[PDB]
Amino acid sequence: MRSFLNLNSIPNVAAGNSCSIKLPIGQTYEVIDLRYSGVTPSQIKNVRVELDGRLLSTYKTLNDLILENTRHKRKIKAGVVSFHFVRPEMKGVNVTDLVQQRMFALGTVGLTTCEIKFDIDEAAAGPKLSAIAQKSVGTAPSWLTMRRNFFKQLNNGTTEIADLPRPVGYRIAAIHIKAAGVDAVEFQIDGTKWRDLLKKADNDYILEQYGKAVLDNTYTIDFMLEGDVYQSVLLDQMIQDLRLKIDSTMDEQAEIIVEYMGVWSRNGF
Amino acid sequence: MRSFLNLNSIPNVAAGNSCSIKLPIGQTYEVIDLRYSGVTPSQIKNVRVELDGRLLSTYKTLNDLILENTRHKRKIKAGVVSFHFVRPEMKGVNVTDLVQQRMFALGTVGLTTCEIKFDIDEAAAGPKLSAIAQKSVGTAPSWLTMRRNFFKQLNNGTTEIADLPRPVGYRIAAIHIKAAGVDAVEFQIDGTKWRDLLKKADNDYILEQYGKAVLDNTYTIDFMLEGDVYQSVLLDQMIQDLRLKIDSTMDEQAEIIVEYMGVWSRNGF
Amino acid sequence: MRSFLNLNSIPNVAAGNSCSIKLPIGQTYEVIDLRYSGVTPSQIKNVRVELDGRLLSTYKTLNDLILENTRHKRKIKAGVVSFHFVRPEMKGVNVTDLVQQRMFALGTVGLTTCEIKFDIDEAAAGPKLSAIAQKSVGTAPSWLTMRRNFFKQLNNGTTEIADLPRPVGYRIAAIHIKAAGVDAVEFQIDGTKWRDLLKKADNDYILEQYGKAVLDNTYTIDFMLEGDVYQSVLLDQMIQDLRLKIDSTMDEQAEIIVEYMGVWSRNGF
Numbered sequence A, B, C: 001m002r003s004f005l006n007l008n009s010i011p012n013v014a015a016g017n018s019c020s021i022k023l024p025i026g027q028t029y030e031v032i033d034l035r036y037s038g039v040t041p042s043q044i045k046n047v048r049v050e051l052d053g054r055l056l057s058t059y060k061t062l063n064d065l066i067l068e069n070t071r072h073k074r075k076i077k078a079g080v081v082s083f084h085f086v087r088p089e090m091k092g093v094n095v096t097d098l099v100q101q102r103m104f105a106l107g108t109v110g111l112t113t114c115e116i117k118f119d120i121d122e123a124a125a126g127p128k129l130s131a132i133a134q135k136s137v138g139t140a141p142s143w144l145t146m147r148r149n150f151f152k153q154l155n156n157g158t159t160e161i162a163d164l165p166r167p168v169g170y171r172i173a174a175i176h177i178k179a180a181g182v183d184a185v186e187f188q189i190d191g192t193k194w195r196d197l198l199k200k201a202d203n204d205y206i207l208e209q210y211g212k213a214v215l216d217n218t219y220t221i222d223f224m225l226e227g228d229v230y231q232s233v234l235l236d237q238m239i240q241d242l243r244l245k246i247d248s249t250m251d252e253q254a255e256i257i258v259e260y261m262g263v264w265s266r267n268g269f
């Protein structure tokens, strides 16, 4: 049996303020529903999910969480944005789908602090935020999704990005290139071309082919289209080159979103 | 291999008549498609599913079966209403999804009588009813869904309902509060608040979050949102208090629908 | 990890030409995305999937592949048509859904030639065709879907078709009767009526009930509505009669599509 709780009131919710959603340790957080009003998702900046003071996932703005859910075609409602720790799209290969989905839940056992920090923009009309938690029996943090932010400049022609962090033992579920002039992209590991120079229209067709929604000004490289976690990129230590070849038509700075995965560690990624 | 059969003609289908769909014993009924015309679903009153003369499930009107299917976002077609014994939304935890869904099928082995009784309203224009059965190999009644009806007066303020039947060994998949002025509800068992006083808007958001459709003038407490049968309320013999705290804005009569579950017994619930 | 490749250019793509998509042997083809322009799907005739020179699946026109995907409610996009070897609708009974779906992938190991032949109509405006492959680790051809074409005369009244090929050990996933005047159909094996004389409206309701789309001028007999491969017709070497009783209202020649299934054999069906 799951428990639906109305989280404690968020302290000091005001424009230009730096607030935090301190989660009580002990149980597992499958989903966290954040209700907002008097402020836009884009006005909720620097969203960070921290476990024991260490960064887990980061969102430039709350709007990126809305887009993250939209991509998987999850239920979107105005005035509310959810933090889906449990991945509903997961499919089991040697275990049930339910087990594969719940494995991403935010367990808090052994944790000292679980927080969701963010800053309220100064222009916020009259910010009002509350949260509801869909919890289950306690478990260790364990397997978690680690959304990381990276900013790289793009040229008009070809741009190569090979300096992406490769935490050993971790995996890469997907890579999102946020740019308005990306025509085609190619992904390779150690010379091996896992993703040919696919045109945007072709890449976007495959995405939609798997029930995903194409995000505006974004080139998504989904490594878990089938929902199989073992299809994701395994950051094996012996890997010598993890490269991305981007064919752009504009000279701009792109925001590269990398969805990492791995067993959460006190001293890990 | 399944068998699709055109059930025998329904005897005496006329306005103001009391008809019955007598099902032949021997096999398993996964789904029963009831075609209707010259009558409205609301004109088909007191729908009772009886096994060996005992009541299994009850519907005030056929319209409640239409709403039951609509809630799960099942295919709805005008002129036809189906009895989904097999629950398509079920997900397996230690077994396959298919096994978890088919486990609810209406097995008839060992039964003496299997009937679907109902009364045709007098205002019925020109009632015409036929049925089709989607069957499979015979099995005992076994695990079945037992829809029960309850009527309780709801006040403007706070009302508490703790006298709901607690058949030992049985489970509760969901509870539907049919009232027009329900603002928030709270569910608890033995003091433990499994469902905080959740506002309708918040409760309805979680429901939709799991692919469910919100029913008009209804507050649904779904204990199987994930499709996992083990998330439902297990009516343990030791439970001392099963309470519901309803915050209404109107003084009215609510129809409380309780979806029970358990292994069918000739002398059980 | 899967590999998305831009297949080699299709040789001699012109109106009235006979082209072929020669697939490199070694890996497994889960899906093949065929992009087309300057030609209609109906202008791409006699589509044949050949393994070692032998016929596996056949499509009168590329439009039949579009309808095949539409029926399962797969993502349809103008200018592109995919060959879904892996069946996304598959559900596991004693194995995971993923295993049951991927089991249909087009493995090429041990093969000498893998081709997708077709003829470009003479009326083609300015045909332009390219292909992309979603591949995975190599496997033998193994379990494959074998779409077969049959033409039979339907009468206005009742027609019976009992001369359908019954390859031993193979299965039948579905049968599609392409005719404009089919009212009802009945399916039986050895006298046993597995599908009663179901009216089109009733048959089509069950189809939609399982997330399928009804095709125009087609009576589909889906034996895998639940996604369970074990629900399909097992062509037992002991079946004496496999009959189809069609109640038509027109006198026309129907195109009977039979989706066979079985482990591909160099000297088999």
Ligand SMILES: [Ca+2]
Pocket (backbone or CB within 6 Å): A102, A103, A104, A105, A106, A107, A140, A141, A142, A143, A144
């Ligand atoms: Ca976890």
Ligand SMILES: [Ca+2]
Pocket (backbone or CB within 6 Å): B102, B103, B104, B105, B106, B107, B140, B141, B142, B143, B144
């Ligand atoms: Ca049962």
Ligand SMILES: [Ca+2]
Pocket (backbone or CB within 6 Å): C102, C103, C104, C105, C106, C107, C140, C141, C142, C143, C144
């Ligand atoms: Ca295969």
